[PDB]
Design a protein around this ligand. Structure first.
Ligand code: MN
Ligand code: MN
Ligand code: MN
Ligand code: MN
Lengths: 198, 198, 198, 198
């Protein structure tokens, strides 16, 4: 049975970049609901599965992808954020970024562009491409999770659902993106990255 | 050249159901941006078309559908609301609703469910199916407009992008849906309906 | 564990409308593979499910929908075809068709159009809409099954994957559609329909 | 006005790998139809654009992408094949393949897997990622063209619509993929590659 992870920190710990109200709603309402609906959906899917009811199995897919994906994505996102965050990565991950994108600031420009470019709801990602052995930026619609839908390993996600920023930044997604760089947990991203070098 | 239509009322006219801050942002920022991007995309498409640049044309399609759709949808939406609206429609539209959905209450439930059910950004619609000669509810993703993507003539739209409600209703989409019924302009919906009597 | 249904008839029994070669390949190769891959995929899904591996669950969805859907769709399609088929339905189903589409020939025109209009692979369907209580035509992409993805109950399906006709009709899908009316099992469609009137 | 390009060789030139009946149908029927529908759709779009009919424009998008994409893709495909092709590419393209995929064999496996893996109609592509300055494999659905929908410059395409192989290889897509390697025009693929050296 899945459950809602606690944050590594207090709801106000990312101010002023992400205010407390958004963090509270985002965690305790949006993510909580994903977990609840995921549990429901998985239980329904097992019943369908046991019965070899393929029509029901297929009818359950939108809910599983949306809620399952929301659970995966948000779980990663809190670990990707930290009051102790911001600045620049160092060591191999910084070397990898320079190698694959030219430099850190070119990387930021590219992930910003992928995130601002989502028309509708979705996520921008820095991922790791296992078969190519290098970093890769991708954007995902709605709650479609990166690994499940692209095969890429998620390292850093930027939520660009309106609920992630609207109470603070209103319609100006690029101010949100500028501010979020101050709370990125590069320690976590580096752990995710080093886990890929196996 | 497309233009941003004025609202048929002041930004505060739909209080307390939809507050003034949302109406002002929704019209002055979101819709405004759709209009300019639509105009720019149309001019780019003319150039691509004049050179027979098929790749350019296809690459422009997402911006044309998103911004053109956005302009269509919001232009309809403002006319679908009124400070003087609410309650039940009068005349033939109510009888069509009873014929096709069983009753007004049943219809409201269906349109509400279609709207609350969008798993991402989008719109709920009451449409007219000209081929079948009856009403039809449908949901559309992002800014994909009803007529251009499904053929159905839009009668009433409910915006369920988060920007349509978040500042007031936070994550609670059903509270927004319950409130909006108080400001439906049935005169406008009837006008749109009668124009389908074909 | 799912399995491949035997046809109600011999591979050559729909000649000259659908030749034996297509029926043999279509059943013993295309459908067989759907069943095989569906079984594999369901077994993998249970393992994922037991483990609460949502990323794997989501990664399995394309295969389940495609192969599961291919199993659902083809299973229905053979029952929808018969050497004993063709002509016109009678009784309530014919009455329903006249009611909802004007007449049988208007219905044929509409299902033909939905089937010929698929750009790519897919299916045209006559379905039953439970909540509206009437017939409904819809088209589905690839092997996306009607009930699983639209909620409509399938009554009659027309396969418009190229493998359904190419060896005989080559690129001319409209000759295929004209010919298939001669082998439709209206007895079966009527059973499916009457099962919906509950 | 777009035109149907002549093949750079006779319909039988690619025997026995792709037979003459397929080449003749593929070019004279499938591609021919894409060209006329593209031209007609472009003229319709000009009219819609000139009137500011956004709904009309959006309604034309599926035909423009499908027929325009079809024209793009097949125009590339014919040039990607040769009676004089096969074997391994010479020069820098082979070294780029080794750099990006590990070796030619590995590349062939990846492109084969991307192609055989399309769950419906579509195309497998070897592309160039101008932003990353390296090769990239991708699959596209239906006739969605590579550059206009992903940004990647097409170098080599493999058609995996059933019409590309069915008359010869029946359902066995892998046998078609194994054969087509015998007729790849690496001179053309190299030309396309060198043009990306940007
Ligand atoms: Mn979120
Ligand atoms: Mn809106
Ligand atoms: Mn089939
Ligand atoms: Mn083709």
């Amino acid at each position: 049975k899945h459950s809602l992870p606690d944050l590594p920190y207090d709801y106000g710990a990312l101010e002023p970049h992400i205010n407390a109200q958004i963090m509270q709603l985002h965690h305790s309402k949006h993510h909580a609901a994903f977990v609840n609906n995921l549990n429901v959906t998985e239980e329904k899917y097992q019943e369908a599965l046991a019965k070899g009811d393929v029509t029901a199995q297929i009818a359950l897919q939108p809910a599983l992808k949306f809620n399952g994906g929301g659970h995966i994505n948000h779980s990663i996102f809190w670990t990707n954020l930290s009051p102790n965050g911001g600045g620049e990565p160092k060591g191999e991950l910084l070397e990898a970024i320079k190698r694959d994108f030219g430099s850190f600031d070119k990387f930021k420009e590219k992930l910003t562009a992928a995130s601002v470019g989502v028309q509708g709801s979705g996520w921008g990602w820095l991922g790791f491409n296992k078969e190519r052995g290098h970093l890769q930026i991708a954007a995902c619609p709605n709650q479609d999770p990166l690994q499940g839908t692209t095969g890429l390993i998620p390292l850093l996600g930027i939520d660009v659902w309106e609920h992630a920023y609207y109470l603070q930044y209103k319609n100006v997604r690029p101010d949100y993106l500028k501010a979020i760089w101050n709370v990125i947990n590069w320690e976590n991203v580096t752990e995710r990255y080093m886990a890929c070098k196996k």
